[PDB]
Amino acid sequence: SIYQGGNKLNEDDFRSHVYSLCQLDNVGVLLGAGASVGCGGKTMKDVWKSFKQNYPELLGALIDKYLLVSQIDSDNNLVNVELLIDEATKFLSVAKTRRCEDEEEEFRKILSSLYKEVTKAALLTGEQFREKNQGKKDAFKYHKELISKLISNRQPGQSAPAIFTTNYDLALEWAAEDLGIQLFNGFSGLHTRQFYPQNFDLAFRNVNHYHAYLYKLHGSLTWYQNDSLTVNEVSASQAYDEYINDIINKDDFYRGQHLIYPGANKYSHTIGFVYGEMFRRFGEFISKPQTALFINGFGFGDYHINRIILGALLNPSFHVVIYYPELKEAITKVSKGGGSEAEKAIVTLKNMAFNQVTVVGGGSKAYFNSFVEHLPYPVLFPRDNIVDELVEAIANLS
Amino acid sequence: SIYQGGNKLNEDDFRSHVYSLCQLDNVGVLLGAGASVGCGGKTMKDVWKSFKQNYPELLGALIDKYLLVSQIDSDNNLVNVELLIDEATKFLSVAKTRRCEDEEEEFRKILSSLYKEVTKAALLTGEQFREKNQGKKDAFKYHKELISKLISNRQPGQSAPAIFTTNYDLALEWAAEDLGIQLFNGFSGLHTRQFYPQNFDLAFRNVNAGHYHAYLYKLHGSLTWYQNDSLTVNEVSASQAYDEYINDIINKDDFYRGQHLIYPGANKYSHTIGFVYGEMFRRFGEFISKPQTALFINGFGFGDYHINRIILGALLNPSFHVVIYYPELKEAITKVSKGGGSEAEKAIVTLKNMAFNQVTVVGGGSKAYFNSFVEHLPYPVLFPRDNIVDELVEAIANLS
Amino acid sequence: SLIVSTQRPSELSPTVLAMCSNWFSLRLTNERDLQALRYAMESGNEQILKQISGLPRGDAVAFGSAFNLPVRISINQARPGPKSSDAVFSEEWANC
Amino acid sequence: LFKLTEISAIGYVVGLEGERIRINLHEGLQGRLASHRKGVSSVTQPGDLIGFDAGNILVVARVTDMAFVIPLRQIIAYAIGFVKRELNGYVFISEDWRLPALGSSAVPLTSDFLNIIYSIDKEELPKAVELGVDSRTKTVKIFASVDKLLSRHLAVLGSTGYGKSNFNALLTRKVSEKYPNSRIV
Amino acid sequence: KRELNGYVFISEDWRLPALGSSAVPLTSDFLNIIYSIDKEELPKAVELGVDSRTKTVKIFASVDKLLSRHLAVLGSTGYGKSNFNALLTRKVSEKYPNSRIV
Numbered sequence A: 001s002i003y004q005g006g007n008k009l010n011e012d013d014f015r016s017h018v019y020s021l022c023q024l025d026n027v028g029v030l031l032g033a034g035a036s037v038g039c040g041g042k043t044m045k046d047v048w049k050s051f052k053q054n055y056p057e058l059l060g061a062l063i064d065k066y067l068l069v070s071q072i073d074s075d076n077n078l079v080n081v082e083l084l085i086d087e088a089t090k091f092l093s094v095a096k097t098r099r100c101e102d103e104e105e106e107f108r109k110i111l112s113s114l115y116k117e118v119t120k121a122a123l124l125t126g127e128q129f130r131e132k133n134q135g136k137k138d139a140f141k142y143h144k145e146l147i148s149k150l151i152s153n154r155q156p157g158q159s160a161p162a163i164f165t166t167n168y169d170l171a172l173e174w175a176a177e178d179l180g181i182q183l184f185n186g187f188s189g190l191h192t193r194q195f196y197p198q199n200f201d202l203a204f205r206n207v208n209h210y211h212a213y214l215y216k217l218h219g220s221l222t223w224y225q226n227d228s229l230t231v232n233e234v235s236a237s238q239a240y241d242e243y244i245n246d247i248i249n250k251d252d253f254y255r256g257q258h259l260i261y262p263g264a265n266k267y268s269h270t271i272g273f274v275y276g277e278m279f280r281r282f283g284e285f286i287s288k289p290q291t292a293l294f295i296n297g298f299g300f301g302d303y304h305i306n307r308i309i310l311g312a313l314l315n316p317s318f319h320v321v322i323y324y325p326e327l328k329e330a331i332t333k334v335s336k337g338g339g340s341e342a343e344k345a346i347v348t349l350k351n352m353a354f355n356q357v358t359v360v361g362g363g364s365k366a367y368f369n370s371f372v373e374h375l376p377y378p379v380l381f382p383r384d385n386i387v388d389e390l391v392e393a394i395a396n397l398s
Numbered sequence B: 001s002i003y004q005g006g007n008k009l010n011e012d013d014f015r016s017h018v019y020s021l022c023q024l025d026n027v028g029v030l031l032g033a034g035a036s037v038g039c040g041g042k043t044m045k046d047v048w049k050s051f052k053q054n055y056p057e058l059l060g061a062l063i064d065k066y067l068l069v070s071q072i073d074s075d076n077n078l079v080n081v082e083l084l085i086d087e088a089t090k091f092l093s094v095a096k097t098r099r100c101e102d103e104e105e106e107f108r109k110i111l112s113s114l115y116k117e118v119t120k121a122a123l124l125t126g127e128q129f130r131e132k133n134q135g136k137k138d139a140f141k142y143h144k145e146l147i148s149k150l151i152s153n154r155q156p157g158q159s160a161p162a163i164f165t166t167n168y169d170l171a172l173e174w175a176a177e178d179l180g181i182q183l184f185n186g187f188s189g190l191h192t193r194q195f196y197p198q199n200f201d202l203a204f205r206n207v208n209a210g211h212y213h214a215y216l217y218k219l220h221g222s223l224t225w226y227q228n229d230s231l232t233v234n235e236v237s238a239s240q241a242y243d244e245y246i247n248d249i250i251n252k253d254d255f256y257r258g259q260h261l262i263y264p265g266a267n268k269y270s271h272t273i274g275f276v277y278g279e280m281f282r283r284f285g286e287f288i289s290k291p292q293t294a295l296f297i298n299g300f301g302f303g304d305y306h307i308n309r310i311i312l313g314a315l316l317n318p319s320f321h322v323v324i325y326y327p328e329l330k331e332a333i334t335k336v337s338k339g340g341g342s343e344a345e346k347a348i349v350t351l352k353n354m355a356f357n358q359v360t361v362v363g364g365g366s367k368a369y370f371n372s373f374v375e376h377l378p379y380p381v382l383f384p385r386d387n388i389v390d391e392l393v394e395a396i397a398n399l400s
Numbered sequence C: 001s002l003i004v005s006t007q008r009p010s011e012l013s014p015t016v017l018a019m020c021s022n023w024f025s026l027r028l029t030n031e032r033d034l035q036a037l038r039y040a041m042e043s044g045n046e047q048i049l050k051q052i053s054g055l056p057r058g059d060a061v062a063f064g065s066a067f068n069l070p071v072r073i074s075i076n077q078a079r080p081g082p083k084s085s086d087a088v089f090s091e092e093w094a095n096c
Numbered sequence D: 001l002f003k004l005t006e007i008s009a010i011g012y013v014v015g016l017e018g019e020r021i022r023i024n025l026h027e028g029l030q031g032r033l034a035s036h037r038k039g040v041s042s043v044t045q046p047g048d049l050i051g052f053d054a055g056n057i058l059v060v061a062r063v064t065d066m067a068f069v070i071p072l073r074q075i076i077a078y079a080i081g082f083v084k085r086e087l088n089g090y091v092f093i094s095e096d097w098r099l100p101a102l103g104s105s106a107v108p109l110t111s112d113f114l115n116i117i118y119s120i121d122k123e124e125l126p127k128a129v130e131l132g133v134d135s136r137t138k139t140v141k142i143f144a145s146v147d148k149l150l151s152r153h154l155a156v157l158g159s160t161g162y163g164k165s166n167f168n169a170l171l172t173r174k175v176s177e178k179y180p181n182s183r184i185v
Numbered sequence E: 001k002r003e004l005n006g007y008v009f010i011s012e013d014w015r016l017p018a019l020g021s022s023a024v025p026l027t028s029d030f031l032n033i034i035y036s037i038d039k040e041e042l043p044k045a046v047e048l049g050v051d052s053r054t055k056t057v058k059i060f061a062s063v064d065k066l067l068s069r070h071l072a073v074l075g076s077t078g079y080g081k082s083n084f085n086a087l088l089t090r091k092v093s094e095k096y097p098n099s100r101i102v
């Protein structure tokens, strides 16, 4: 279950090792799509499983006529969705620029169906995506604990935590707006909000433990490009009224260079700038000395991220902890013969004779809801909530 | 057989003595042609045999007419090859100047055969001379060890190691370009390489707080040096030299240009070529005249009068130390004791007989070779004696 | 060969203590029981004597001829151990 | 492509005042922990051990003071010997009359160098018994030679209820299982 | 430190804080932890008094560790030896009604 250096460990030594790692100069976290299923999300397998069931007429065309998806992975449910969306967008643009009317109407339906399927699963609260104070509910209990623990473990004079993610939902912002913390995401302004890459070099100071950083590597639901050649961000209640209510309850797709999720429209030099900046900032972080990183919920199916992670182990002062539930299946399938690229990639780094690599597996001991309890609380941290008992009395006064 | 002042000492005392000499202010190494025989080279007496086996017609005219070489020296294979090319070039220049047409062809025909023989014995890789990454092979394994050991035992605020050599092959450059160290040889540029004698007084530093560099003095030239149509000295790469003038020398049979090449000590009468040779000797003489110098000698045959004169005069300083390797002590001791042998044997035995604690002589055949020389030097504690990078590089290459 | 175990090193002949090659020392809290240990060993070490006044249970400081430099050790438990203890008053007083 | 050391630095020497050494730390270090290939180490609290790279030997020192002087930080240490490489392993010598030079780097001590310090000669391993572990870090095991313990007289001292009898029982039992033809009364 | 859901006090004196650490006063809750017994001798514990400096924390002691070897009470005249002897004897007799005291 717990492997360090090729050999096994017990629970207590692993917990002590985790505690020792949080006290270094730089601490970072990378989260995948597996960390949102506890609040209403879905995994990439389920999205394809539902799309294949709901739309069987369009499935044959993608395999036979246009050669965008093969048959073996379609039957096994191991397809990549964002690459498919990018390729479809490129196909549509090329078809539009040469005036081929027959092909132009063929891809609009495909893109509309794919966007409907991916957007319906990104909304974590259904029709309540408009209202306020969504982070007060019980589904976001661990997202608050993660941030609180990861902030409270820093001594004065040290840096602020960094949070990488591959999701495009609004869980972390909702969790942070309730505790009372501010997140830097690269944007500024209210009446016209724009993207400035230099906003990541700033920090707060008191003139008489406030901030954290958030990097999104695949965009977000509230980002879009208008006629002007600048990217804008709005609130959830405004996106719902502007362009989200039509995607779900209507067959609407008429703008091809509008949305910035997921990883689409990379052929435009104004949109790829954001993705490039995010990836470059991710790359520059793990090249610093005295760094520790945690990975949870991320299936190792990306070539570039895997290449970036492996190359950073050449430095003596880089450490990492990886969570992967289905480990025994991969070990048996690679020992017996066969397996996909993810299993080979995880196994080859499991067997290395390095003390900088640690892998934790299990059935439910490697989930997101168990990763938080491995992180400790300070001795003097307040826990007893005795402030809402007074707010209720104030409200009762009327 | 180890002697220190005429007395014998064991291996442990010799190793202890070597350890103490590696923590002085100045440390240097002088190498010869016998140190490149484990990579594919040949000694100086293996070239005369080839020349007199392949060209038996010019040998008679080179003895009976111009008196350029003695019969006794030729029969015993004791001819100084690099001391004949300069005289041949002088003869050719005089004949060309005074317009003796019949005498030009004869001297153009013997130089074409001497260069064809000396060049082929210095490639070390045959036709794998124009390729890249030649330092990754197993033949250059001990040169890397020597370079690494010299650099990795110097404290901050100390000088950088110096290397003198009588070779003109590219072994040390190939060894150094694999470890990532930069060597200073007096040249600067990429598109027009030129010789600057003032760049021997330069060093690197870090703008934030590295000390990875050394000096290489080549006393007889190099394969890659030549003088173009102008009066300047340029340097090129191995591939460019091979495509320019080496291929024709090795293959073609009627090729000779003139005062073009700068190896070995050939065209000294020109005043733009000998200026290069003089600086190396001057800076060699300047180095060993410092208060706390220690020098290691390996691969040298002690057949040069000037180097011997320089070394002997430098010993009248109470803080100069020398270590010499000569794997033929007994065969010289007997010959000197009976009647007296050759000049090199006399010089080495006279230097051995001195009653100083500064001179140390080591013999014993294969026990005093280049490979054995490395292990006598100390090994640093913090040097990583493991393999961690290669596995990660192979794993990265395996991906995709 | 002798092994001496005592809790009052000051109530011994100085010659017996001064003719030993190794010393093991556990917690020792008394000003007159530390002067004997200081006298028995040679001079040249004073920062190692301050730790003895506050060593926890099961820890000791060892210095002599079989140790290169003084070390603070955590000793293992013996299995099976010696006799546990004497009688306990509570058990016999509550056997009604 | 040249890697002279596989460890990271902590500070650099700025002065010598006889047999005591002064070190200033880098700007980034705040959390008292330094990480290397084998794990994490603590390098700031008094009583710890650090090292310096001086040519082809390694000097060993013990931390005594730590104070301010963004403000800088300073460390005072004292040397207790050095570590040497002879043929293919390592040996520890206990002479403390050698000091490093200005500009030298200060590095932490891993668990492999800590083993060499608290170790005995290899040829005496079969004649050795196990007592315990290191108190501060609890990683290294301690051995001693029987022929050097029970040759002259041995002394055990301590207060009541702290572990004299346990040590006596362990030491006497371990010898009998090793030398069955021995007398104990 | 913490053990299961509360706190425990250890009495080793070689661990020191780091530079820049902040200093706080001790609340009466931690004084109760510092002057406590080992969570299992409470059924065989006897109350003797209160601490002198703050007069807020009660003091208990174990009979087995108290009346095992000899005990000594010292003091000048007029300061309260008889009070202590009477209190200890009476509240030991009350707890164990099958005891012998002379």
Ligand SMILES: Nc1ncnc2c1ncn2[C@@H]1O[C@H](COP(=O)(O)OP(=O)(O)OC[C@H]2O[C@H](O)[C@H](O)[C@@H]2O)[C@@H](O)[C@H]1O
Residues within 6 Å of the ligand: A032, A033, A034, A035, A037, A038, A043, A044, A045, A166, A296, A297, A298, A299, A300, A301, A302, A305, A324, A325, A326, A366, A367, A368, A369
């Ligand atoms: N409750 C849970 N807690 C933790 N992990 C879970 C849980 N449930 C499932 N998992 C694990 O969570 C994982 C789900 O893997 P997927 O969501 O398909 O992969 P991704 O999120 O990286 O996909 C996006 C990336 O795909 C491209 O490559 C780009 O890089 C994109 O960023 C499995 O290991 C599950 O066992």
Ligand SMILES: Nc1ncnc2c1ncn2[C@@H]1O[C@H](COP(=O)(O)OP(=O)(O)OC[C@H]2O[C@H](O)[C@H](O)[C@@H]2O)[C@@H](O)[C@H]1O
Residues within 6 Å of the ligand: B032, B033, B034, B035, B037, B038, B043, B044, B045, B080, B082, B166, B299, B300, B301, B302, B303, B304, B305, B326, B327, B328, B368, B369, B370
């Ligand atoms: N494997 C070996 N390892 C070490 N030494 C060896 C080996 N094989 C032979 N030797 C010894 O290597 C030596 C061969 O010496 P040579 O190459 O002929 O002489 P040089 O290189 O000094 O000639 C050039 C200079 O001499 C001219 O006069 C000019 O002035 C030049 O400056 C012998 O001692 C061999 O025993």
Ligand SMILES: Nc1ncnc2c1ncn2[C@@H]1O[C@H](COP(=O)(O)OP(=O)(O)O)[C@@H](O)[C@H]1O
Residues within 6 Å of the ligand: C057, C058, C059, C074, C075, C076, C077, C084, D158, D159, D160, D161, D162, D163, D164, D165, D166, D167
């Ligand atoms: N090194 C140790 N590890 C664990 N327990 C110990 C150790 N030393 C002593 N003890 C405990 O102390 C108790 C008695 O200590 P003892 O050795 O009799 O004290 P004394 O030294 O006064 O004879 C034993 O029951 C034992 O469990």
Ligand SMILES: Nc1ncnc2c1ncn2[C@@H]1O[C@H](COP(=O)(O)OP(=O)(O)O)[C@@H](O)[C@H]1O
Residues within 6 Å of the ligand: E075, E076, E077, E078, E079, E080, E081, E082, E083
């Ligand atoms: N803890 C106490 N609280 C109140 N009064 C005390 C206390 N201890 C002693 N005294 C007072 O001391 C007086 C006599 O003390 P006594 O028992 O005679 O001491 P001693 O026997 O040492 O002379 C009593 O009148 C009593 O009031």
Ligand SMILES: [Mg+2]
Residues within 6 Å of the ligand: D164, D165
């Ligand atoms: Mg006892």
Ligand SMILES: [Mg+2]
Residues within 6 Å of the ligand: E081, E082
């Ligand atoms: Mg009284």
